[PDB]
Amino acid sequence: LPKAEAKELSAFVQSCVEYKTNVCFTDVAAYESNQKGVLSSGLAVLVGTHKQLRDPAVQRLPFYNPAVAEAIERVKEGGTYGVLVEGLANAAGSKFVRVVVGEVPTKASRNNCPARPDVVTALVTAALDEVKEPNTTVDVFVLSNAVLPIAAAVARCGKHNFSAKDGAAAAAYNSGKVSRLQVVFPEPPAIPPKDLEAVATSTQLCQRLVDAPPNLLTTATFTEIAQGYAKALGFDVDVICGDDLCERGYGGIYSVGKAAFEAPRLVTLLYTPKGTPVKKVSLVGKGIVYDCGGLALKPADYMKLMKHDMGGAAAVFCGFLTAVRLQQPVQLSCTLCLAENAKSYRNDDIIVMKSGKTVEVINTDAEGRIVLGDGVFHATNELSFTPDVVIDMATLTGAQGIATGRHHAGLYVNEEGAEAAMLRAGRESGETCFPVLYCPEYHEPEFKSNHADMTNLMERRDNAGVSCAGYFITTHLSPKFTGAHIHVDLAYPVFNSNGATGFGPALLTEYFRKL
Amino acid sequence: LPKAEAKELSAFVQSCVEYKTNVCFTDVAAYESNQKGVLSSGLAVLVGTHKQLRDPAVQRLPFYNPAVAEAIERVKEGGTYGVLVEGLANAAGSKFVRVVVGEVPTKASRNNCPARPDVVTALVTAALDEVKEPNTTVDVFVLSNAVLPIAAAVARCGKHNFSAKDGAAAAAYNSGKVSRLQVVFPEPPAIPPKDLEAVATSTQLCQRLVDAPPNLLTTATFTEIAQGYAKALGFDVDVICGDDLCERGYGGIYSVGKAAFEAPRLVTLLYTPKGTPVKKVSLVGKGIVYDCGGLALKPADYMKLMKHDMGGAAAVFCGFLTAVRLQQPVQLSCTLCLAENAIPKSYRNDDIIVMKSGKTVEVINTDAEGRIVLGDGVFHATNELSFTPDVVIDMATLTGAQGIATGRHHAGLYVNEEGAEAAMLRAGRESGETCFPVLYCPEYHEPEFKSNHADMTNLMERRDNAGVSCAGYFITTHLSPKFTGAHIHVDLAYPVFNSNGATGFGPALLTEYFRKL
Amino acid sequence: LPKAEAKELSAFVQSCVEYKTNVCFTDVAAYESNQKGVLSSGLAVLVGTHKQLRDPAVQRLPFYNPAVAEAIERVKEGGTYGVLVEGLANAAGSKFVRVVVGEVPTKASRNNCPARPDVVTALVTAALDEVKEPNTTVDVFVLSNAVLPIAAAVARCGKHNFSAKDGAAAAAYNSGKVSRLQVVFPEPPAIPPKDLEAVATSTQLCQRLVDAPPNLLTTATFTEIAQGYAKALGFDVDVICGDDLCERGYGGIYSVGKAAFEAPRLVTLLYTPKGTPVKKVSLVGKGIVYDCGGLALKPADYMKLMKHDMGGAAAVFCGFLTAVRLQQPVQLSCTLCLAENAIKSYRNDDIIVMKSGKTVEVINTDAEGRIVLGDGVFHATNELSFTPDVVIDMATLTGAQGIATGRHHAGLYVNEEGAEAAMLRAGRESGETCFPVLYCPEYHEPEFKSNHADMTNLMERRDNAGVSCAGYFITTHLSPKFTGAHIHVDLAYPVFNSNGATGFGPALLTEYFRKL
Ligand SMILES: [Mn+2]
Ligand SMILES: [Mn+2]
Ligand SMILES: [Mn+2]
């Protein structure tokens, strides 16, 4: 309300709308030609497997010398090893050029990405820690040709573009500590550099949205950001806000967000490609502020996970942006379920969902699943088309971590074929997933209610936690949808010790490529 | 706001602004000259050590007789013993006169006050149980000459001036159970009686502010009480509140109190004496309503500690008033960080606050709020005033770790300069309101507040790594670059109260600290 | 016990009794005289402050070149920076030599060691991670002359000598991953190299004992280790074991350990120097197996802290050994309160008669371990051949210590201000830092009030000077004979870190004895 906050929020909105990636892409041939073998600064990174690092092609690189060769021998698997090379020509005018070698493991299980982009991110991050001059450009020489997962991994790595440190609050929370990164592949990339920049930009925007604190990224500012991109890229944006949600039957999202300073919003984006689209897909994202809870973990654990509660909404939004920027051949909708949930209040309330089914709120902490029900029905009932696939993404349960872990998002899906496709998309993109038990027969009884059609939380916590939360959402699917529904629980993969990971967008982009 | 509720608050403000102590001070010589051996009432109290009680000077007192002599023999250490004296001359017209003997211990460690005023408070408190009438003055004969600690101890004791019992709410919450007390020192006091009364008044005013419930002492009423004394005693008052705090850049104090019904207020009082001041001191005080929390103790424990959450702001305010009344030669500022932490645990969790100092704070725990408001207060004091202080003293009921660390009777001291530490520690032993130092080592405190997106968090990552010190360190990071003096952080979470309520801890310590500057 | 266990336990006892340090000490001049610019191996380490690293004497060092100079510019404060130097002379004949520069901060508060040996340990540990061969000698050039704290800091660093990894359990749990280290000071050390090695040996022996799991370092094996050192170094050992503790009135230590498989033991060691001792100091150490608890922290936290329960007994024991090896002029006794706490309801509300004659109600069975220190403190002050001037008890006692003083500073509860200042000086000089906790017996006594016994074993209110109250309980069992200074050291947290035991205690005791 005050002028100081009003201007701060407008500046933040602009920064997200105007975000440009720090990562550019090229190949070894074009690099030598365009840059004349001159390194961009006094720091370079060489990343690859034990076999790749010993390839003859490595010896022909500009920075290569006997000191680098010894680094390739001395470096550990999953570790880095730095050496100084004196008298090397570089644009920073540095006396020495630091070459940090990083070894990527070949070991990869059937449920992981063979390129191991998880380690690639870790390796470059460790190499960038030596940087004291952040305004420099850093050449990152990768020996793998898996352009998509590597593009995401490098965008993921290093200092985050969101920062409030050292006066960055005055600069619209744009970090000054980030280095420009030039990823140099061995061959010309199968996906154009401009397309890879789009993927890397979305990963970092998603990261920015999830990193941002709830006083900056609000329901209002998210909507303003989405409307900003609609004006720039030319896609349709529909907004159902405040009491219009109640008046038009959206009781779930209205109930969850009615008590907030900012009104709840159901923000639907629409993209339609030129000519015949290969599929019609609807995305639904959970974007509830100050909303994280459950029974599987302790209350203190959920307050930690609450930091990344926009992960679902951010994921689908940036995946949508990539589809428009790459002009992918998919008719796409993206519904953002936005609301501020600001313990006893609303407890035992019976709300009338948009689907017409009634829900008893036995636990007010589990409101995220409720807004997804309205979003799912909206996508499958109220749009100008009926989607072939529905993909809901959300940071839903603590059980997800216990079930599938920190690196694999849980998939709850009705059709096997769609599950397999999404699993392949995770392994190809590096944003990996794993299936969670699909068995509606055993999920329905857990939501039994004396007075309403269903409760909003399973009676017994130890009966397939991730699955049951997924099942709840499926009960609010419109009857005119009879396709594949993919529920993605990404409570944990959305973050690590350094903050947001931008998990989701690249998985969607890779999924749409193989449709 | 309802009329009856608005009328109640105005009456409470007036009771605080116009408060007067029930204690008066004199000596035996002047007492025999003024009262002629006629006791003030039918209850007399004799407090002193085992040795002091057996001194020849004791029998020369007007109330002494063979019964009182036997009382001295039968009394136990730290206990009381009462005897009647039939037909002993007194002004109250009582047939008997009760004489209570209290034995003070001589045992006192190098960290404690030698006079043991903690027991003097307890002995007199027990003695006043046998009071007959509500309008009488009880003569308290102290055998010690430690005037300042005995003054604060006696002001501390007995029934509290704040009360809502037996219809006292209709009398602006002024208790009718508080007996008048006349402290009779052996020799004329080193501090003048008029000055000792100002100290006892500040102790009991501090007690009233802390005892008062949050529906009576609010951010608005504290400010109105501050503004009242400013007009009465003639000192300046600056008040930044509401959206002005946000617009001027005080994001910490603003974020904490923005949800409440009454706006958050940064209330600075300025006192500048006549001539050259011996020192320039800035005082900062935590006064957050409904705000108490941490990780060291259980949630149920912090709700008990919440009761006395104004202790920091009250101690800093009352010490300021004593300096103005005694006209101490110290240029003094006093910033009260006032806000109501109103409305859930999830609200404002993971928010990033742009503090007045320019440094950003990630709020990982919304229960640790006053620690943040002190950061804005400390910067204000060291950056925005017309002068730059030589010493900054912040006082607050901050951490549960203080109780585990230094205990119920000693406030934790976190201070950068050994010299300033020793002075405050000496002040604590001299005043009776004791302190003990907490580890100072910024090297090991800084890493506990590591944040991914902000310059710091508001709470330490590991609770078992010098929790009193870390809370103090956070505050120091928001000190101005202009400031290069001694910072004294006083954590008084526990010493501010006992089983009977507020203790009025702080003001006397500050006054005794100012005296030796 | 089975033959396989007895064999393993005997092998472990021998490894501790015959432990030799991996660290040796010298100076830049002697280094040049002995090996004339030939590095000991393909790894060299340079550790100093921002100012020290830019001293002109650093350019003249054997490993220096333009790359090393660039490392000094690019290294971060508190961090390390490695560079390869091609064709540098080294005994290994390696084609390249890795030179790792580490910057030490000058920042240090009045309660910390000015040399910041905590960072030195971290820097050298990080450097040794890039070691090629595990056995080779690594030259560690330190630009500081504070020899004692640097000695303990380097002993502290790197891979620990105790290990059960990769078949080490077949070699008596001696690690094969530890590198030899040559510390090279700028000037000849003020303390002799051989004396510095003894300090380094005690730090690492202490580290070994604390790192050791409770199925290897038992009450029996600790005694056997002590008896082994008694025969080798030539000092007297007294062992009161089992029912003899009960028969001779040691009800505290007996009650705590009576239920175990191995009996409880009060092991007292005695060292007397030749001539006139400067002081008569008695050491008491808590060495209770499977014993850690309190009210300040959660039950899960005390299980984590239970790993380092021998820290007190180990620190006192290894400090004694250093006094015997260096032949320090202090008459020393060392009482190890050893017991295995088996097997929560058992012994709850028991009233025990302590050796002091005072009775203790056991209101909390988890806090049985302050009790064993009570019997030990009385023994040292009443039952010995001499009456000590100072009694120093050491124990990993309370979770409140971490809350009060932190991870790097041990809590000091002591009656006399002079003895406190001395121990604080010892901590700042040695690097094994301490900080005082509130001393005020007036306010501590009421917390242990009991209806039936003289006292309880635990404070009634946890939020009333937790570390101090634990100390006060111990002081009540001091002998009437004793009128000296009592120093209670609560080292619950400083005894360990993320990598395991730190060997905190011995170097603190050594530096304390040196300035008496
Ligand atoms: Mn991880
Ligand atoms: Mn008390
Ligand atoms: Mn640590």
Partners of residue A496 on adjacent β-strands = A499
For residue A50, how many other CB atoms are within 10 A of its CB? 13
Nearest chain C Cα to A83, which residue? Answer: C83
The answer to whether residue A369 is catalytic is yes
CA–CA separation, A136 and A310 (whole Å): 32
Cis before residue C343, ω within 30 degrees of 0?
yes
Q: Are A411 and A484 in contact (CB under 8 A)?
A: no
What is the Cα–Cα distance from A409 to A476, expressed in whole angstroms?
22
Q: How remote is the CA of residue B433 from the centroid of ligand 2, in Å?
A: 13
Phi/psi region, residue A105 (left: phi>0; alpha: psi -120 to 50; beta: rest), is: beta
Pick the CATH number of A189-515 from 3.40.630.10, 3.40.50.10490, 3.30.300.30, 3.30.70.141: 3.40.630.10
Question: A2 and B247 in contact by Cβ < 8 A?
Answer: yes
Tokens matching residue A105: 């493991």
Residues B348, A215: C-beta atoms closer than 8 Å = yes
Domain C1-188 and domain C189-516, same fold? Reply is no
For residues C215 and C1, what is the distance between their CA atoms, to the nearest angstrom? 12
Instruction: Determine which one of B116, B208, B258, B371 is catalytic.
Output: B371
**Percent helix, strand, coil in chain A (nearest 5)?**
40, 20, 40
Which residues touch C244 (CB under 8 Å, ≥6 apart)? Answer: none
DSSP for residue C178: P
B16: tokens are 């605080």
Give strand pairing partners of B44.
B99, B139
Residues 6+ apart with CB under 8 A from C141: C28, C44, C45, C46, C47, C61, C63, C184
Ligand nearest to the CA of B122: 2
Q: What's the token pair of residue A13?
A: 């909105």
The C-alpha atoms of residue A253 and residue A337 are separated, in whole angstroms, by: 7
Domain coordinates in residue numbering, chain A: 1-188, 189-515
Is residue A493 within 8 A of residue A409, CB to CB? The reply is yes
How do A265-271 and A236-241 pair as beta strands? antiparallel
CA distance B193 to B183: 10
Residue A123 one-letter amino acid: L
Other CB atoms within 10 Å distance of the CB of residue A348: 11
Please indicate whether, in this complex, the C-beta atoms of B360 and A164 are within 8 angstroms of each other: yes
Contacts of B366 in chain A (CB under 8 A): none
Topology given in CATH for the domain delimited by B189-517: Aminopeptidase (3.40.630)
Measure B308 CA to ligand 2 centroid, in angstroms: 15
Q: Let me know if B298 is a catalytic residue.
A: yes
Rounded to whole angstroms, the Cα distance separating C450 from C439 reads: 22
Cβ distance B52 to B45 under 8 Å?
Answer: no
Give the one of A74, A83, A95 whose C-beta lies nearest to C83's C-beta: A83
Secondary structure tally for chain B: helices H, strands E: 19, 19
Nearest ligand to the C-alpha atom of residue A406: 1
Which of residues 401 through 430 in chain B touch C, CB cutoff 8 A?
401, 403-410, 418
CA-CA distance, C516 to C508, in Å (whole number)? 13
* C431 φ/ψ angles, rounded to the nearest 5 degrees: 95, -20
Give C322→chain A minimum CA distance, Å: 39
CA distance linking residue C364 with residue C386, whole number of Å: 35
CA–CA gap between residue C435 and residue C403 (Å, rounded) = 13
What is chain B's alpha carbon radius of gyration, rounded to the nearest angstrom?
A: 23
B440 touches chain C (CB under 8 A): yes
Chain C: partners with 3+ C-beta pairs within 8 Å? A, B
The answer to whether A70 contacts chain C (CB < 8 Å) is yes
Pair A26, A34: CB distance under 8 Å? yes
- Residue carrying structure tokens 């005050």: A2
Cβ of B453 within 8 Å of Cβ of A342? The answer is no
Nearest to A321 by CA among A182, A401, A437, A205: A205
Q: How far is CA B488 from CA A293, B337, B478, B496, C349, in A?
A: 41, 17, 14, 18, 44
Q: Chain A within 8 Å of C77 (Cβ-Cβ)?
A: no
C120 near C150, Cβ under 8 Å? yes
Q: Rounded to an integer, what distance in angstroms lies between the CA atom of residue B160 and that of residue B179?
A: 10
CATH of A1-188, one of 3.30.70.890, 3.40.50.10590, 3.30.70.2740, 3.40.50.720: 3.40.50.10590
CB A414 within 8 A of CB A380: no
Which token pair is C45?
């380490």
- Residue A214 forms contact with B (CB below 8 Å): yes
Task: Say whether residue A132 is in contact with chain C using an 8 A CB cutoff.
Answer: yes
d(CA B311, CA B287): 7
Mutate to test the interface with A, among C84, C98, C128, C129 (most CBs of A within 10 A): C84
Method: X-ray
Which of C364, C397, C385 is CA-nearest to residue C471? Answer: C397
Q: What number of CA atoms fall less than 13 Å from residue B414's CA on the CB side?
A: 29
CA distance A174 to A162: 5
Q: What is the DSSP string of C222-288?
A: HHHHHHHHHHHHT-EEEEEETHHHHHTT-HHHHHHHTTSSSPPEEEEEEE--SS--S-EEEEEEEEE
Identify all chain A residues contacting B346, using CB atoms and an 8 Å cutoff.
290-292, 303, 306, 341-342
CB C125 within 8 A of CB C80: no
- For this entry, resolution in Å reads 2.5
Catalytic member of A156, A265, A369, A427: A369
Q: Is C165 on the interface with B (CB under 8 A)?
A: no
Could you say which of B246, B360, B452 has the minimum Cβ distance to residue A169? B360
Angstrom CA distances, B181 to B90, B142, B200, stand at 15, 12, 11
Within 10 Å of residue B37's Cβ, how many Cβ atoms? 12
Query: How far B446 CA lies from chain C's nearest CA (Å)?
Result: 12
Q: Which CATH class is domain C189-516?
A: alpha beta
Write the DSSP assignment of C82-143 as a string of letters: EEEEET--BTT--SEEEEEEEEEP----TTS-TT-HHHHHHHHHHHHTT-SSSSSEEEEEE-
Ligand sitting nearest the alpha carbon of C460: 2
Which of the residues A20, A298, A406, A448 is marked catalytic? A298
Nearest to A508 by CA among A400, A430, A422: A422
**Measured distance CA(B468)–CA(B436) in Å, rounded:** 12
Read off the tokens for B483.
């400031």
Q: Which of B327, B329, B513 is nearest to B421 (CA)?
A: B513
User: CA C172, CA C166: separation in Å to the nearest integer?
Assistant: 12
CB atoms closer than 10 angstroms to residue B191: 16
Rg (CA), chain C: 23
Q: What is the DSSP letter of B57?
A: H
Distance between CA atoms of residues C396 and C465, nearest Å:
16
The C-alpha atoms of residue C141 and residue C46 are separated, in whole angstroms, by 5
Who contacts C333 (Cβ-Cβ below 8 Å, separation ≥6)?
C268, C269, C270, C271, C281, C282, C283, C380, C384, C386, C388
* Distance from C-alpha of A82 to C-alpha of A43, rounded to nearest angstrom: 10
Nearest in space to B510 (alpha carbons), one of B307, B315, B233, B359: B315
Name residues whose C-beta falls within 8 Å of residue A37's C-beta, 6 or more positions apart in sequence: A62, A89
Find out whether C45 and C141 touch, Cβ atoms under 8 Å: yes
The interaxial angle of helices A193-211 and A505-513, nearest 10 deg, is 140
Residue A495 contacts residue A396 (beta carbons within 8 Å): no
Cβ of A214 within 8 Å of Cβ of B351? The answer is yes
Distance CA A360, CA A255 (A): 12
- Residue A180: phi, psi to the nearest 5? -70, 140
Ligand nearest to the CA of B496: 2
Please tell me the distance from the alpha carbon of residue B410 to that of residue A173, in angstroms, as a whole number. Answer: 43
Separation between Cα atoms, residue B208 and residue B311, nearest integer Å: 10
**CB C356, CB C452: distance < 8 Å:** no
Q: Compute the distance between CA of residue A303 and CA of residue A83 in angstroms, rounded to an integer.
A: 43
- Comparing CA positions, the residue from C397, C422, C421, C425 lying closest to residue C411 is C397
User: Which among C66, C71, C96 has CB closest to A70?
Assistant: C96
The CA distance from A117 to A148, in Å, is: 10
Q: Closest Cα of chain C to A60: distance in Å?
A: 21
